[PDB]
Amino acid sequence: GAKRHRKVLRDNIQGITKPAIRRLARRGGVKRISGLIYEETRGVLKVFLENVIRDAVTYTEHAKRKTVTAMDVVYALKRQGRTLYGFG
Amino acid sequence: DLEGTTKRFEHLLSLSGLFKHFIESKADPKFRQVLDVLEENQFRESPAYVNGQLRPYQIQGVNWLVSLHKNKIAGILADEMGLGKTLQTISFLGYLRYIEKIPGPFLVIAPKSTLNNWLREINRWTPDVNAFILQGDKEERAELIQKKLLGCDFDVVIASYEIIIREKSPLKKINWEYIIIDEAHRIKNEESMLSQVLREFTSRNRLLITGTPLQNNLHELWALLNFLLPDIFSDAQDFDDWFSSESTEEDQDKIVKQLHTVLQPFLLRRIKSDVETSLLPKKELNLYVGMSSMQKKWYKKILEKDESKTRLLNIMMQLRKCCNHPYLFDGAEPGPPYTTDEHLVYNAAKLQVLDKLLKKLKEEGSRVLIFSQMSRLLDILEDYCYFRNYEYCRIDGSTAHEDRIQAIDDYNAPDSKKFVFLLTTRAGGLGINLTSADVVVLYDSDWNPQADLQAMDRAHRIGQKKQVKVFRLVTDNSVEEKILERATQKLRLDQLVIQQNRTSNPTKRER
Amino acid sequence: AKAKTRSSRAGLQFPVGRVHRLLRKGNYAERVGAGAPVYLAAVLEYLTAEILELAGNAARDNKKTRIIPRHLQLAVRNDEELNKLLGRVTIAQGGVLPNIQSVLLPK
Amino acid sequence: SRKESYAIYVYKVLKQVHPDTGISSKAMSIMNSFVNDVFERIAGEASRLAHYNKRSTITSREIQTAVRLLLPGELAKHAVSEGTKAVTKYTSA
Amino acid sequence: KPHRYRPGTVALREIRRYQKSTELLIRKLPFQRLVREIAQDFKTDLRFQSSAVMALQEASEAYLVALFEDTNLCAIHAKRVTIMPKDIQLARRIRGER
Ligand SMILES: Nc1ncnc2c1ncn2[C@@H]1O[C@H](COP(=O)(O)OP(=O)(O)O)[C@@H](O)[C@H]1O
Ligand code: BEF
Ligand SMILES: [Mg+2]
Numbered sequence: 001g002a003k004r005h006r007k008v009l010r011d012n013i014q015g016i017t018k019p020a021i022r023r024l025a026r027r028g029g030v031k032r033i034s035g036l037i038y039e040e041t042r043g044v045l046k047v048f049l050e051n052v053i054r055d056a057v058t059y060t061e062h063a064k065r066k067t068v069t070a071m072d073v074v075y076a077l078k079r080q081g082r083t084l085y086g087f088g
Numbered sequence: 089d090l091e092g093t094t095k096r097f098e099h100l101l102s103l104s105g106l107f108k109h110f111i112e113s114k115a116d117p118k119f120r121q122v123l124d125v126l127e128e129n130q131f132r133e134s135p136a137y138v139n140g141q142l143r144p145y146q147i148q149g150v151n152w153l154v155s156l157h158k159n160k161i162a163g164i165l166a167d168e169m170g171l172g173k174t175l176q177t178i179s180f181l182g183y184l185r186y187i188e189k190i191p192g193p194f195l196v197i198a199p200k201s202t203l204n205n206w207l208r209e210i211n212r213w214t215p216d217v218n219a220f221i222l223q224g225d226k227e228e229r230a231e232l233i234q235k236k237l238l239g240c241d242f243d244v245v246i247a248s249y250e251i252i253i254r255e256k257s258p259l260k261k262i263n264w265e266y267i268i269i270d271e272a273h274r275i276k277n278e279e280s281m282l283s284q285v286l287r288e289f290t291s292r293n294r295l296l297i298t299g300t301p302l303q304n305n306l307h308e309l310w311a312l313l314n315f316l317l318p319d320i321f322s323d324a325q326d327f328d329d330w331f332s333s334e335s336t337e338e339d340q341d342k343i344v345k346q347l348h349t350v351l352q353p354f355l356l357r358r359i360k361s362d363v364e365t366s367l368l369p370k371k372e373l374n375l376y377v378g379m380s381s382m383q384k385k386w387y388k389k390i391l392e393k394d395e396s397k398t399r400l401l402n403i404m405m406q407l408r409k410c411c412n413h414p415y416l417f418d419g420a421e422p423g424p425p426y427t428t429d430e431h432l433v434y435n436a437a438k439l440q441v442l443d444k445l446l447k448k449l450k451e452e453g454s455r456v457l458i459f460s461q462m463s464r465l466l467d468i469l470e471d472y473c474y475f476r477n478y479e480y481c482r483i484d485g486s487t488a489h490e491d492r493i494q495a496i497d498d499y500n501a502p503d504s505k506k507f508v509f510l511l512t513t514r515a516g517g518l519g520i521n522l523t524s525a526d527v528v529v530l531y532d533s534d535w536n537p538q539a540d541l542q543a544m545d546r547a548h549r550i551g552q553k554k555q556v557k558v559f560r561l562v563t564d565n566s567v568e569e570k571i572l573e574r575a576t577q578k579l580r581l582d583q584l585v586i587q588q589n590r591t592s593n594p595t596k597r598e599r
Numbered sequence: 600a601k602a603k604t605r606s607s608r609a610g611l612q613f614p615v616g617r618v619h620r621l622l623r624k625g626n627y628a629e630r631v632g633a634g635a636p637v638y639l640a641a642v643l644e645y646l647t648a649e650i651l652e653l654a655g656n657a658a659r660d661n662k663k664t665r666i667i668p669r670h671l672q673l674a675v676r677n678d679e680e681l682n683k684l685l686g687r688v689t690i691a692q693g694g695v696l697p698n699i700q701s702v703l704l705p706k
Numbered sequence: 707s708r709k710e711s712y713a714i715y716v717y718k719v720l721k722q723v724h725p726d727t728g729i730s731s732k733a734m735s736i737m738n739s740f741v742n743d744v745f746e747r748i749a750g751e752a753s754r755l756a757h758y759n760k761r762s763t764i765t766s767r768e769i770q771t772a773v774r775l776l777l778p779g780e781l782a783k784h785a786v787s788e789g790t791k792a793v794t795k796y797t798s799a
Numbered sequence: 800k801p802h803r804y805r806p807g808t809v810a811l812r813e814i815r816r817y818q819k820s821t822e823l824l825i826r827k828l829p830f831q832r833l834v835r836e837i838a839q840d841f842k843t844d845l846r847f848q849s850s851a852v853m854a855l856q857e858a859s860e861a862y863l864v865a866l867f868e869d870t871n872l873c874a875i876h877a878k879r880v881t882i883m884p885k886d887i888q889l890a891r892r893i894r895g896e897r
Contacts, residue, residue: 027695401846635765
């Protein structure tokens with residue numbers, strides 16, 4: 001018994017896994033990796049994310065919706081001067 | 089093909105002139121060429137190659153089945169569940185094996201929980217047929233492919249819902265005799281991927297089988313029906329507006345007779361109540377219990393959005409889980425040691441009545457089955473089963489293949505002390521027999537009443553030697569009340585026609 | 600007379616009437632010259648072909664018949680002019696130019 | 707709903723350069739993506755210059771200079787010719 | 800005796816693989832819930848488009864990718880072959896991103 005509560009430890013941010021991280025680094029061209037990188041990366045990626053996400057959400061309400069659109073986030077990207085092609 | 093197509097109409101056109109009407113209602117290939125020329129111009133002894141006795145309706149179904157074969161027309165063995173319809177099929181496969189002497193390639197499909205039973209019953213009754221449980225891994229399925237399946241060293245093959253989709257390509261190259269489809273409920277959706285994998289195989293006959301008939305709609309009815317004889321209908325909305333949904337506008341309820349008259353000589357229903365074979369009905373009680381006062385805090389916290397700062401993207405399920413069990417909301421159990429005691433049954437609305445009924449049924453010797461929707465909730469029941477120290481076996485969605493068999497065997501073992509039996513709803517009760525059990529209880533209600541009917545009759549089949557005492561759990565003053573009423577709504581829109589078919593901040597700068 | 604498209608009149612392929620409308624609703628000025636929709640529209644053809652021709656070249660170098668963003672990624676990023684032009688452009692699914700650092704090469 | 711885009715014209719130009727090469731759809735969307743961008747960047751740049759000299763109407767003088775401002779080096783050099791050739795062709799035609 | 804490669808030869812092989820590959824390296828299910836996690840601190844209870852859900856990753860990766868290769872430049876200049884966070888932070892500071 002007492003197994004209904006045995007796995008409550010998700011805490012999303014590790015969901016970006018070390019194998020992927022190195023897989024990411026391997027595509028980038030890094031040959032060998034410190035172990036503290038993985039965690040430090042988690043910080044860099046997240047802090048990146050909301051700033052757009054904030055801006056990305058920042059649009060949504062102004063047009064009085066409740067469902068985030070790619071075009072919305074498309075504009076979100078442009079404002080910081082990193083433009084993307086391919087989602088209209 | 090066309091000779092059979094002419095020969096199919098030899099039996100199709102012998103019915104009412106409605107088939108000519110449907111052929112002439114197409115808005116047309118050369119089916120008219122063979123229609124115009126026609127327009128202007130056994131084994132009732134329970135054959136003993138089986139090892140046992142066939143029931144009288146069983147023979148009739150088989151004789152009805154052999155007629156469809158001799159007619160070269162298709163159909164659906166729609167006999168009510170637990171009427172030994174597996175024996176009817178096993179006898180029918182013997183009918184082809186011995187009378188016509190064509191032991192050939194056969195394909196049968198069963199839910200994951202049920203592949204054991206069909207192999208078990210085929211061995212018990214007609215041991216002369218080569219069948220496999222096509223289970224195992226990607227490599228473990230391969231040596232079945234090249235060695236025996238590619239070697240044509242078999243008669244029937246027993247696979248699951250997904251395996252055939254996993255094995256579509258190695259199965260196309262083998263032409264079949266029937267595609268035997270048990271519990272044909274995934275086919276209700278045309279876009280259900282299993283439908284597009286089955287319209288691609290080439291078998292001379294296509295024997296669809298079910299435990300319950302159509303669930304909700306006429307659209308669904310010809311969804312089963314369109315794959316039966318596809319070259320004949322080849323139409324989707326043509327069939328629908330032809331019958332116009334039980335006269336949804338005029339409510340004549342007399343054009344339904346035309347629906348019944350085509351399907352009565354095209355399809356077969358038998359019910360348990362008519363030919364008992366068990367001579368004992370089942371009881372039903374709906375244990376309306378009040379929703380627990382302790383969780384009333386969180387239930388209000390869900391209604392008023394008071395615990396906080398989470399999703400409510402499906403308020404349906406959120407209230408459903410609170411209607412089901414409070415500790416499911418990730419914090420209703422505050423204990424860092426996660427105490428396991430009477431507080432669980434205390435804080436829960438249902439388990440108090442469950443604890444009472446478990447104590448009663450323990451003394452009465454009632455061998456109970458429990459069905460539920462949430463596998464996570466079953467963990468708590470598994471924990472609470474540990475609290476009461478009952479023997480049992482937990483089958484859940486994707487536990488194992490051999491574990492399903494062994495847990496079933498231990499529960500159905502003679503004089504099995506496994507007093508309770510944890511089981512899911514959509515993974516557990518789709519064809520297995522549990523005659524060792526008598527009483528079956530639902531923890532929660534499902535938005536599919538025929539599935540509710542499908543699940544309940546697990547213990548109430550041929551071989552049930554006690555009175556089936558159903559105790560459905562419905563929460564008082566809850567949203568579960570509306571689901572059951574809606575469950576009744578979908579029930580009565582369907583039962584009414586089926587019964588006719590059989591009969592006929594500011595200034596705070598950080599700086 | 601006989602209707603004759605301006606793009607034909609310039610001997611161009613790009614729809615100038617579309618843009619003169621678009622310039623008109625684009626609120627870039629309250630009045631707009633006539634050859635400006637024209638003037639840009641041809642140069643529009645120039646760069647697409649310029650990239651498309653590069654897109655064709657790389658497409659051949661893997662011996663495919665249909666152009667993909669990886670090709671597009673390769674082409675522009677292989678072009679120092681385009682890459683300088685599109686430095687703030689990131690390409691969907693485009694991938695990266697294969698390039699390993701000299702010191703990562705083994706002795 | 708109606709949606710207007712640039713695929714057909716891009717498709718025509720491709721068959722000008724590579725009359726045999728095919729094309730995906732996503733990359734075509736990229737092309738639609740790309741064209742609109744440079745479409746935008748020139749125009750507002752074109753607008754603000756007319757603002758800088760306080761004029762009210764945008765002609766090729768406006769368009770060309772920003773093309774020189776926007777395109778680097780050889781593209782600007784070559785494309786101005788591409789612009790220059792068409793304009794005279796239009797005025798003559 | 801086991802045939803183990805010299806450490807790094809595998810990595811150079813890996814480095815090659817992905818530099819021709821073009822696909823994502825981040826699992827979708829972990830990925831989107833991250834965003835669904837994040838949205839709460841701005842507005843409760845939004846509803847995401849997969850296209851948007853997809854579109855996040857490309858920026859997510861492309862950003863982090865360009866980070867890596869710059870960070871790779873660091874240890875080389877720092878006469879290393881193993882990357883340190885001090886490299887990573889350094890670029891972002893050189894990127895002027897702290
Ligand atoms: N004529 C018969 N003779 C002996 N046993 C039967 C007969 N009909 C049904 N049974 C028993 O009743 C049970 C019903 O199982 P099955 O035939 O699989 O029904 P279903 O196919 O509807 O699930 C079987 O285990 C079978 O042994
Ligand atoms: F009645 Be059968 F087991 F589906
Ligand atoms: Mg049966």
